[PDB]
Ligand binder design. Sequence first.
Ligand SMILES: [Mg+2]
Ligand code: NA
Length: 282
Amino acid sequence: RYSKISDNYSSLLQVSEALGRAGLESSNLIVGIDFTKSNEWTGAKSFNRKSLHHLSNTPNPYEQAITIIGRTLAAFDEDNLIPCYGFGDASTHDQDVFSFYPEGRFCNGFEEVLARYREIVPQLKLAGPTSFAPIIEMAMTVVEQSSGQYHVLVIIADGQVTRSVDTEHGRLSPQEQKTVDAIVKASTLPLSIVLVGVGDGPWDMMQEFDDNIPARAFDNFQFVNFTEIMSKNKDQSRKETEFALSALMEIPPQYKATIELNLLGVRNGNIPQRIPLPPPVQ
Ligand SMILES: [Mg+2]
Ligand code: NA
């Protein structure tokens, strides 16, 4: 489907212009980066047995995804300010997020996101387990504090939310419970959530995860498999446009939904204020 569309898109500029014609207006971007220890081994097939957070003269999958999404959404970002958070390292585990800059200061453009990411990475201790509840709750808090301006939260991760050891008997983990609850509660705000999967996975459980999210006033969640798209044997430009479209094609409909439900521009009033930890760096 996005493959069929991308066959006509040679640049991210075209994708940006298409999003605009599709109704997307002022749109803000929040980025959350997975710093769990599994990043050390989920690059076995997709990244030459290197860590997915390996730094070098070629971008790792996190840097690549940030670049494509950032370049595509930049045109809609009026203040160019991107709240950016890490989670899953030893300072946050599955409980918190940390801001890329102290005092929760936002990054100035995706270029600063990328630069600051490279500074932070060598100082982190990767940990776990995996929950997206803190990062989704952080995004909720930012949306509320902005008085309901429309945000897209892009979570880039190398593994699904941690499951129960007794998952075979239908039991949910607290990580699953809180993450699903956060997705549902986030639908009371003008907020879209895109989960970008990098690395080997496994990601075969995501369709089912999506299907099992409880009913919401609008569908505010998308999963996109970066690795599967970028592993196709076609030109770089069209792998990039396919990924951009696969991640963002549904953003303008979702935006329109937040207007129809009168979520846009208002405070919900029921949103706990999550506080980001400082970046755990020198
Ligand atoms: Mg992981
Ligand atoms: Na913004």
